[PDB]
């Protein structure tokens, strides 16, 4: 599920395209998983060991990131394509 199905679910999802005017497009391409990480009150990442999750009533989860390519067309035959990495 993690290695293959998540990537395929994001990829086969329809691209978003919107209009009111400038056209906008969004496309999800690549997926990333860190290790299970805990952010303290200050917000510092640290590797969450599962025993800490058992003791502290946390959830032994890892964050999920995706590269999002936004392509905006301003009805002038141009396309500005900006790719936000690790969203």
């Amino acid at each position: 599920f993690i290695q293959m199905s998540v990537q395929r679910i994001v990829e086969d999802a329809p691209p978003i395209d919107l209009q009111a005017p400038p056209r906008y497009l969004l496309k999800f391409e690549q997926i990333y998983l860190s290790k299970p990480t805990h952010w303290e009150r200050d917000g510092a990442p640290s590797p969450m060991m599962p025993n800490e999750a058992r003791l502290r009533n946390l959830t032994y989860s890892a964050p999920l990131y995706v590269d999002i390519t936004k392509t905006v067309i301003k009805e002038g035959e141009e396309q500005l394509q900006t790719q936000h990495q690790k969203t």
Binding site: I2, Q3, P45
Partner: peptide, 16 residues
């Protein structure tokens, strides 16, 4: 396939 990231490539955006 899903790429793995190390903990050093996680920017501190989750605190901002």
């Amino acid at each position: 396939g899903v790429k793995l990231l190390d903990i050093s490539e996680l920017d501190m955006v989750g605190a901002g």
